[PDB]
């Protein structure tokens, strides 16, 4: 039976391939060739944030486009005031091996976690003024690779056990488990309307998950190796992924196909982080060459570079309003461009 | 009148920065160790000799060591291995001797040594279950490592008294199998410190203390151009 089920799966895969080919009347590169290029983009470092001792693994902008949370391998979260370069909080962690962090959309909570397989949620606004652990979420069997906040009482996480999860913070229990990946899940991205999210994994694939049902809606392939970063397009009908094959790809959720490939002959390093600008015209990606390339998302040309780090550039983000880009690397420095 | 908030923020920075300076003092004086090993490796025994990750702290002669043992992580190491790329050393525990587990250990040592992020991390290598190797050999290696049939013990070997020369050949052959990889790939940035340990041996902690010392010393000597 096992061989007949494998043949059935291959037949369904062939049907999917044919259905996708049927819709490929034209490529993106054949439509946008009449669109003026963005030109040369020359961002400059405006502020550099110092205070971390170990390599920075995660950074996330708050919803006010003014505060940052960052996590190093020392076991310390720092809240920063991007405008005045001042620090706001410096949270010690139970364990130093933290791989992700997230800033709540309300600004009330900070989440983090890593190799301890536990997502720690810190309450930044307490009556005593001290930052305390409000919840420790446990149940994932692998390392925690990414955390995202839907609301103050709901967090979406991903781990190294090939499973994503939806957690109810107040009760501390897991409510939805998203399975179907075969490799570690590396990065999550939430839709602007936080009804869907997309999950990249160490399988050269990505999945579109429906938050409320727990079902996987689409599976996207096209990358050759492990996917390290994923980011929803501002519109919400597309996402960009980066992988270890030194390629970035734009996928469209409505055509269920790869839409554009961002690559260059001189890039043989992986893409640690991916993010879009407010308008979606620029795509920013961090690499292992200790820099960041700015791509024209509609043309796949390089618009500019962001140089100023001396070790691997692990994280990257853009403010909701769009005034600045923040990056962090393994040299323990967070730099802000504009 | 809004200046009072900026002043408050500066006060916050003063408090945070002072705490960070104290933490930096603790951080740089602490030596972090990653503990890896084979499925039958006595990693638990090594921890005893004194969630998703376990932490053990040691103070040896007023020097603080922080040893991390990989807990219930998935067997796919290629993603969380990158995290431990700035530890003082990686402690890799291999049991000597049903699959060819030793070849798996060699393939893992090979993968860890040649990693693009671990090129500046030394490896302290423990070869365990020496008495089981001794009993098995004196009672077969050629069925996994044919070149063992032509291997001879190095003249500068220092075996323990009472050992059967065939056991010394097996031990040094395995050590050499690891060292050939270590020497072939290394470019003076990191070194392997293989050791032959027993299931019960308290000297292991000293073996670690001294190996870490040697690592830091030769690192600095490399920086001063004296080595």
């Amino acid at each position, epitope marked *: 039976e096992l061989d007949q089920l494998r043949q059935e799966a291959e037949q369904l895969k062939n049907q999917i391939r044919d259905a996708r080919k049927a819709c490929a009347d034209a490529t993106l590169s054949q439509i946008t060739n009449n669109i003026d290029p963005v030109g040369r983009i020359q961002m400059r470092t405006r502020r550099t944030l110092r205070g971390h001792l170990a390599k920075i693994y995660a950074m996330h902008w708050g919803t006010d486009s003014r505060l940052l949370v960052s996590a190093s391998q020392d076991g310390k979260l720092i809240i920063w005031d991007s405008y005045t370069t001042n620090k706001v909080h410096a949270i010690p962690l139970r364990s130093s091996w933290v791989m992700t962090c997230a800033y709540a959309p309300s600004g009330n909570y900070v989440a983090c976690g890593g190799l301890d397989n536990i997502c720690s949620i810190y309450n930044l606004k307490t009556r005593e003024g001290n930052v305390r652990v409000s919840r420790e979420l446990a149940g994932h069997t692998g390392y925690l690779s990414c955390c995202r906040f839907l609301d103050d009482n709901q967090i979406v996480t991903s781990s190294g056990d090939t499973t994503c999860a939806l957690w109810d913070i107040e009760t501390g229990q897991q409510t939805t488990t998203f399975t179907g990946h075969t490799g570690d899940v590396m990065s999550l991205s939430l839709a602007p309307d936080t009804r869907l999210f997309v999950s990249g994994a160490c399988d*050269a694939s990505a999945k579109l998950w429906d938050v409320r049902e727990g079902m996987c809606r689409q599976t996207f392939t096209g990358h050759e190796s492990d996917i390290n970063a994923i980011c929803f397009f501002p519109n919400g009908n597309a996402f960009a992924t980066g992988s270890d094959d030194a390629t970035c790809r734009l996928f469209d959720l409505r055509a269920d196909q790869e839409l554009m490939t961002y690559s260059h002959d001189n890039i043989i390093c992986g893409i640690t982080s991916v993010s879009f600008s407010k308008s979606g015209r620029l795509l920013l990606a961090g690499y292992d060459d200790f820099n960041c390339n700015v791509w024209d998302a509609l043309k796949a040309d390089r618009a500019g570079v962001l140089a100023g780090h001396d070790n691997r550039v692990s994280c990257l983000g853009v403010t909701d309003d769009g005034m600045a880009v923040a990056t962090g690397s393994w040299d323990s420095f967070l730099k802000i461009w504009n | 009148d809004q200046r009072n908030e900026e002043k408050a923020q500066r006060e916050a920075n003063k408090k945070i920065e002072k705490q960070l300076q104290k933490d930096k003092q603790v951080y740089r004086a602490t030596h972090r160790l990653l503990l890896l090993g084979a499925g039958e490796s006595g990693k638990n025994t090594i921890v005893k000799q004194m969630s998703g990750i376990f932490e053990t702290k040691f103070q040896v002669d007023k020097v603080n060591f922080h040893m991390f043992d990989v807990g219930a992580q998935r067997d796919e190491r290629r993603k969380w291995i990158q995290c431990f790329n700035d530890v003082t050393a990686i402690i890799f525990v291999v049991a000597s001797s049903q699959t060819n587990r030793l070849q798996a250990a060699l393939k893992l040592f090979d993968s860890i040594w040649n990693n693009k992020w671990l090129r500046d991390t030394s490896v302290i290598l423990f070869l365990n279950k020496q008495d089981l190797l001794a009993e098995k050999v004196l009672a077969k290696i050629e069925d996994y490592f044919p070149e063992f049939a032509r291997y001879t013990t190095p003249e500068d070997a220092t075996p323990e008294p009472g050992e059967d020369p065939r056991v010394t050949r097996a031990k040094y052959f395995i050590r050499d199998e690891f060292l050939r990889i270590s020497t072939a790939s290394g470019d003076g940035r990191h070194y392997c410190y293989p050791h032959f340990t027993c299931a019960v041996d308290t000297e292991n902690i000293r073996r670690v203390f001294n190996d870490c010392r040697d690592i830091i010393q030769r690192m600095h000597l490399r920086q001063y151009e004296l080595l």
Partner: nanobody
Amino acid sequence: QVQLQESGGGLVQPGGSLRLSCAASGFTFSNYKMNWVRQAPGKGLEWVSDISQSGASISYTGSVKGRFTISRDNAKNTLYLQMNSLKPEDTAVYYCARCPAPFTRDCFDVTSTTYAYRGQGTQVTV
């Protein structure tokens, strides 16, 4: 999407020989190291052979040296395995496996848990 499909299996008597193959799709074959691994009927996956991107460096487990050879063809994206002088100990499911990251000298790909860049395997009974 990336696929590895092994072929050339079957049953032979001790002392016989087989030629195994592996067809790759969905990735640039010449940029990755390739491996052969075996799954014994009652034992966990074991690494067998490792050929570099160019074929300039070939490694074998000691139990197969002098009996097995491997090669690759970058113009066809095909990985082979010549299995000579076979013994009963060689009965196993053989899988074609690719190291996870391109231009890398280190790879973790003999994991018991589902490895993404591995084929379905072919049964080689001796």
